[PDB]
Amino acid sequence: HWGYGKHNGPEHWHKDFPIAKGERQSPVDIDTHTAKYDPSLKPLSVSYDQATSLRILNNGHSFKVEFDDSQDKAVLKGGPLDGTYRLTQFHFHWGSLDGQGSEHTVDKKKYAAELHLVHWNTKYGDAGKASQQPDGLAVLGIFLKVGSAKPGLQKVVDVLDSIKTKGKSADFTNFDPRGLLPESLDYWTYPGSLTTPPLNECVTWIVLKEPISVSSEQVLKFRKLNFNGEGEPEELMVDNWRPAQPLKNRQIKASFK
Ligand SMILES: NS(=O)(=O)c1c(F)c(F)c(S(=O)(=O)CCO)c(NC2CCc3ccccc32)c1F
Numbered sequence: 513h514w515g516y517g518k519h520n521g522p523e524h525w526h527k528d529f530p531i532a533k534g535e536r537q538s539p540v541d542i543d544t545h546t547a548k549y550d551p552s553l554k555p556l557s558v559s560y561d562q563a564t565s566l567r568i569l570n571n572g573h574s575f576k577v578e579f580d581d582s583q584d585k586a587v588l589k590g591g592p593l594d595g596t597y598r599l600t601q602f603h604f605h606w607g608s609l610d611g612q613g614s615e616h617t618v619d620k621k622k623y624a625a626e627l628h629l630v631h632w633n634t635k636y637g638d639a640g641k642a643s644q645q646p647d648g649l650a651v652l653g654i655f656l657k658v659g660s661a662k663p664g665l666q667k668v669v670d671v672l673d674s675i676k677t678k679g680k681s682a683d684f685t686n687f688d689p690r691g692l693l694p695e696s697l698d699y700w701t702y703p704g705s706l707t708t709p710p711l712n713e714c715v716t717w718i719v720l721k722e723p724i725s726v727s728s729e730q731v732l733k734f735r736k737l738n739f740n741g742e743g744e745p746e747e748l749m750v751d752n753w754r755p756a757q758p759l760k761n762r763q764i765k766a767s768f769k
Pocket residue numbers: 662663664665666667668686687688689690691692
C-alpha cells in the first residue's frame with residue numbers, strides 16, 4: 513500500500529500515480545522574497561460559524577476530522593477563489609521531531625506540523641467530482657510551531673488515544689475549527705495538487721503566513737498514533753509529510769506587503 517516509509521513513501525508514489533511528476537504538484541517551498549504581492553487578491557472569507565463536525569478517524573496515513581458538508585455550513589470564499597468552497601475535512605502532517613513535519617516550507621524552513629482544511633467547490637456538487645477538476649478543491653494550510661498550547665486543539669488531542677491504530681474512528685461532534693486559526697489571514701496562494709495519492713492536480717492552495725503555536729505535549733500526542741492496524745508491528749505515525757516538489761512554471765502570490 514502507499515505510505516511514508518522507505519519502501520512505499522513519496523519517492524515511490526509515481527509508479528502508481530504518475531501525476532506525481534506533474535507540472536503542478538504540492539507541496540512547494542515558498543520563497544518569500546520571490547512571491548509576488550498581488551493587490552488584486554481579496555481577503556480570504558472563512559465562514560465556519562455553522563460547522564458540524566461528525567467523526568474523527570485514523571486512516572493509517574493521518575487522522576482526519578470529517579464534517580457534514582451536505583449544506584453550506586462551513587465555507588471558504590474570496591481570496592484567490594471564484595465561488596464557494598465547503599469544508600469537508602481537516603487533517604495534519606507532522607514530524608518525528610519539532611524541526612520537521614510541515615509539507616510546505618517557507619524559505620526552506622520546516623515547521624513542526626501543518627494543518628490542512630480541505631474544501632470543495634460547490635459548483636461540482638460533491639468532493640469526489642470536485643477532485644477531478646483543476647479548480648475543484650481549496651486547501652487552507654496552517655503551520656504549527658511548538659511553544660504555547662493552542663486551546664482549540666486540545667479536544668482533538670484528547671481523543672487521539674481512542675483512534676490509535678489504522679481503521680479506528682470515533683464520534684466527534686461540536687468541534688469548532690475556528691479554534692485552529694491564527695489571528696491573521698494573510699496568505700500565499702498557488703495552483704497545486706493533493707499531497708497524498710491520488711495526487712490530483714485539483715487544488716488552489718492557500719497557505720497562511722502566521723503559524724499557530726501548539727505545545728510540546730499536544731504534538732507528542734500526535735506522535736503516539738500508529739500507522740499500522742492493531743496487531744501489526746508498531747510503527748509510530750510520524751513523518752507523514754511529502755517533501756517540497758518542483759515549482760515548475762508557477763508563481764506564488766502573496767496577499768500582503
Ligand atoms: N475547537 S474547540 O471547539 O475545541 C475550541 C476551544 F476549546 C477553545 F478553547 C477555543 S478558545 O478561543 O481557545 C476559548 C476562549 O473562550 C475555541 N475557539 C473558537 C470558537 C469560536 C472562535 C472565534 C474566533 C477565534 C477562536 C474561536 C474553540 F473553537
